[PDB]
Amino acid sequence: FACKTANGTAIPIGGGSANVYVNLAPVVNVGQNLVVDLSTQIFCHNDYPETITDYVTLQRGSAYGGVLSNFSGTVKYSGSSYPFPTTSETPRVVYNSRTDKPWPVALYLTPVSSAGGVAIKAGSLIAVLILRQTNNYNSDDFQFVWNIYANNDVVVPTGGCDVSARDVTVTLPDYRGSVPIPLTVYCAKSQNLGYYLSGTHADAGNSIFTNTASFSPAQGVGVQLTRNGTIIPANNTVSLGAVGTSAVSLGLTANYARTGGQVTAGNVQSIIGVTFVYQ
């Protein structure tokens, strides 16, 4: 038994180790996938096909470099599927000819959510796969140690941040009272976040929001937001600095506000916009 690759390398009878270099999808989003098909890359054959049958397994598979820290997924071997990095030996593929045929191995990988920037450096070792070879003739047991390198960078683009709903429709207390608003923002990858308020105003200062209630609207009364006791006007950008996976609270409290004449009876409802401006 002996093997060779699509790049310049080879392993002879008895076994050994060799490097394999493969191109990769340059850009993979979180929740998307990456294939590393080595069946186009590694080719093996049987030296004595008239008298001996060769059994070839993927004994072990380990992730290194950017694949180890930034990815996970599976390894396909001759139709069957296993976790990668591996936790077990696969079954056997039979080799019964002198004429080279592919080693049926391919990796299927997904970025983890912490993954961002350059998740795989060009030229870096990404995986070691051990081909194990025995036969139906004697006690021969040889390891063929394939080292896999990436021929290019792989990038995992940063995504938007999530502003956790908490409460969708916030109930306000009876007039005169005020509620703090639960509104936190976290990012899968740390970045600088600015937000501002927007909506229809009664006042010139741009701080009180119209009573949008469709049925039985009350006059002379609006909805006004505060951050640590301070009134926040709409279209004025609060900076939050760097936001990571620890949910940062916007610090909003909902106060009733007086707009015009006598405060009338009736329901009060508002819809406000919190806009997050990404760099």
Binding site: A10, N19, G79
Partner: protein, 778 residues
């Protein structure tokens, strides 16, 4: 201040995460607020609590109020009437399903019933120097049936030489989810962990790692700690940050660290509310047999030994193995192996020892009958040592030593028919070794060797391979040496090798649209230090707009040694397409001259017909999108829907969520989909549908006006001619797909109103999206 007892309409939160809204009874209790919520074991368990991890909770009645604060150390309840909010905190150590990537078992789809075939038709033509010609053909058939959760599979090949149907394999498999295991009947194999792997026909029940979240797989240290208040837990390894989450007050157990058994020490840091920390390091080396704390790997097998060696019998046998992960990084394990002519018992201990590295030691007691009917007793001990990456850049990947007494044998040894391979000369001692060494940022020294003594002879089996591998920018450079001195032969065997890899990507502008950016040059030499030298220059990469086509071309020349000189040439094309794969290969060895040609692919027979594609991989996603014809599937090279809108995906990951998207760029101009993204959660071997709804017809952005004033926001718009409908946004605009050239449109916001008609001039067909205005009723 205390509150008066009573019933409160409240939003129940556990560890800052919403659970449910109910009315909760509060009774006077030992508490800061004077009152305690009444919650049941039922209610607490479903909210995330792991009841058995808390002493006494099994004793209470079904509806008994749990004394949460006395029964659970550091558990807290606060009520806020102001937000109508009940905030509970229970230390995560008592919480279940803490793992990241966790997916509830009941979402695991067993998949549809289907028929399943993989075909590989391949052949090659040889032209020999003296002798003439030769033609070879080979056909591989991988056969399959899915009924519910069962997977029947078959392997059979056909041969030709200038020929027989030689069948290979069959098994019926199923997963048992409550046991997190896999049942396999038929041809299967055993693992080589404890006893040598055996090929066999029979039954196997085995635990399956695949079913665990990736974050829990393999061995990693499980960190136990206490957080005074609400705390931030961060871990670093190999310099870079590898873990980060917030934890409640009280004890916490982190069983979530990704296996990285060679990457180095874990630096844990626990940042508290006030800003004070706990900074400690958890060392982390690992040997393959170690189990993560509280994990059990087991296997039970019974069947007949089917090695494929004709000079061997087929003895019935029983084998079971068990490996268990304990606290403090301990592992106990062992197994048994019973057969008519062989019985064996193994037992082992193993530990992540921390600073000294990682070690396992096991012992095998073997009682054996050889083919000459003589009886033997023997033992075998094996030490496995690992030390993960140093501060000094040393990684002692594996040190191994096995030692066997005279009478020691393996099951395989007894399966033979005749004594004479030779059973008088069984192996004595074996030392394995693999070490790597960092040498600056860019280089890596690699040493690996093995040494085998025997009983009878003084003949050894030496073997040694050193290697140096340097990065120079993009370029990888490798020099390597190997020396192998076998037992039953004379004289050294050597190989000296050098390889250089130059990718062209970073040689051109990053916008470059040229295909050279997907190409690399390679140069390499061999020299067997016995006269023979070879060398090879080559080019390899991918071609076409989707990179379905792979090529390798390389010419070189080998000369000396055996007295055989002359130039060589090798080429390969490789195509991954919509309906299968194709290969061509070409080889020229100065004497031999040969051609390779092959077609491969997958077939699926299902409720909605037969769909073809690239060969299949156990777990199959079936894209079902009637009306989306040449539609590309994202992240799957060459995978396109057929002339019906069906595809079979070669690649999916079991027991996880799988994004399955259609590339909307590749859609026909008159096609839009209700949803361009589907999401699936298949079991291993499962065949799952990913459904997309295609609206085929004109796409239009309509400005709808009424008394020269645009229709209001939120207006429901619905067609008379097609099944399509929309909502009016700003400027009175609505978007509509799958529309006819001319038609009537029904609009309704208050309670039917306006009705509009249109007629697009035929000439607007080629267009993506045409904009027209329409008046209304009244």
């Amino acid at each position: 201040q205390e509150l008066p007892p009573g019933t409160y309409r409240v939003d129940i939160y556990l560890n800052n995460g919403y659970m449910a809204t109910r009315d909760v009874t509060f009774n006077t209790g030992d508490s800061e607020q004077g009152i305690v919520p009444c919650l049941t074991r039922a209610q607490l368990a479903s909210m995330g609590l792991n009841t058995a991890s808390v002493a006494g909770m099994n004793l209470l009645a079904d509806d008994a109020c749990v004394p949460l604060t006395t029964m659970v150390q550091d558990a807290t309840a606060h009520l806020d009437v102001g937000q109508q909010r009940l905030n509970l905190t229970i230390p995560q150590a008592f919480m279940s399903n803490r793992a990241r990537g966790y997916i509830p078992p009941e979402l695991w789809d067993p998949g549809i019933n289907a028929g399943l075939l993989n075909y590989n038709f391949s052949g090659n033509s040889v032209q020999n120097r003296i002798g003439g010609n030769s033609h070879y053909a080979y056909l591989n058939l991988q056969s399959g049936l899915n009924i519910g959760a069962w997977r029947l599979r078959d392997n059979t090949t056909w041969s030709y030489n200038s020929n027989k149907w030689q069948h290979i394999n069959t098994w019926l498999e199923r997963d048992i989810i409550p046991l997190r295991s896999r049942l396999t009947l038929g041809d299967g194999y055993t693992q080589g962990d404890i006893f040598d792997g055996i090929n066999f026909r029979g039954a196997q029940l085995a635990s399956d790692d695949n079913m665990l979240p990736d974050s829990q797989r393999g061995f990693a240290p499980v960190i136990h700690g206490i957080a005074r208040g609400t705390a931030q837990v961060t871990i670093k390894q190999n310099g870079y940050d590898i873990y980060n989450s917030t934890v409640p007050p009280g004890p916490f157990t982190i069983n979530d660290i990704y296996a990285a058994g060679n990457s180095g020490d874990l630096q844990v840091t626990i940042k508290e509310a006030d800003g004070s920390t706990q900074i400690f390091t958890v060392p982390y080396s690992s040997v393959p047999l170690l189990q993560r704390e509280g994990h059990t790997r087991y296997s039970i097998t019974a069947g007949e030994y089917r090695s494929g060696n004709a000079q061997q019998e087929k003895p019935r046998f029983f084998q079971s193995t068990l490996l268990h992960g304990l606290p403090a990084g301990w592992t106990i394990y062992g197994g048994t192996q019973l057969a008519d002519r062989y019985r064996a018992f193994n037992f082992g201990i193993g530990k992540n020892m921390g600073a000294l590295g990682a070690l396992s030691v096991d012992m095998t007691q073997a009682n054996s009958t050889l083919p000459d009917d003589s009886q033997h007793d023997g033992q075998s001990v094996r030490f496995l040592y690992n030390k993960s990456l140093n501060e000094s850049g040393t990684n002692i990947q594996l040190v191994g030593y096995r030692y066997s007494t005279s009478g020691y044998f393996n099951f395989a040894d007894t399966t033979y028919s005749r004594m004479n391979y030779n059973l008088a000369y069984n192996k004595r001692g074996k030392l394995q070794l693999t070490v790597t060494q960092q040498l600056g940022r860019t280089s890596t020294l690699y040493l690996s060797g093995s040494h085998q003594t025997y009983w009878g002879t003084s003949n050894v089996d030496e073997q040694f391979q050193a290697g140096l591998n340097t990065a120079f920018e993009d370029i990888n450079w490798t020099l390597s040496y190997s020396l192998t001195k076998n037992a039953w032969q004379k004289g050294r065997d050597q190989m000296l090798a050098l390889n250089v890899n130059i990718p062209f990507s970073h040689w051109l502008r990053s916008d470059s649209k040229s295909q050279w950016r997907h190409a690399s040059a390679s140069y390499s030499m061999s020299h067997d230090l016995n006269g023979r030298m070879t060398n090879l220059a080559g080019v390899y990469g991918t071609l076409l707009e989707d990179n379905n086509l792979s090529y390798s071309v390389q010419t070189g020349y080998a000369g000396g040694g055996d007295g055989n000189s002359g130039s060589t040439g090798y080429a390969t094309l490789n195509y991954r397409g919509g309906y299968g794969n194709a290969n061509i290969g070409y080889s020229h060895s100065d004497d031999i001259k040969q051609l390779y040609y092959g077609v491969s692919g997958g077939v699926l027979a299902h409720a909605n017909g037969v769909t073809l594609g690239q060969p299949l991989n156990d777990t199959v996603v079936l894209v079902k999108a009637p009306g989306a014809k040449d539609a590309k599937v994202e992240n799957q090279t060459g995978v396109r829907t057929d002339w019906r809108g069906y595809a079979v995906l070669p690649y999916a990951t079991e027991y996880r969520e799988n994004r399955v998207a259609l590339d909307t760029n590749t859609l026909a101009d008159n096609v839009d989909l209700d949803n361009a993204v589907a999401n699936v959660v298949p079991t291993r071997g499962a065949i799952v549908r990913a459904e997309f709804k295609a609206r085929v017809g004109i796409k239009l952005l309509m400005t709808l006006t009424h008394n020269n004033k645009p229709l209001p926001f939120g207006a429901m718009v619905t067609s008379e001619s097609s099944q399509s409908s929309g909502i009016v946004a700003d400027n009175g605009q609505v978007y509509l797909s799958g529309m006819p050239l001319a038609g009537k449109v029904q609009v309704k916001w208050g309670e039917a109103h306006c009705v509009a008609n249109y007629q697009l001039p035929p000439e607007s067909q080629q267009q993506l999206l045409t904009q027209l205005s329409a008046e209304c009723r009244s």
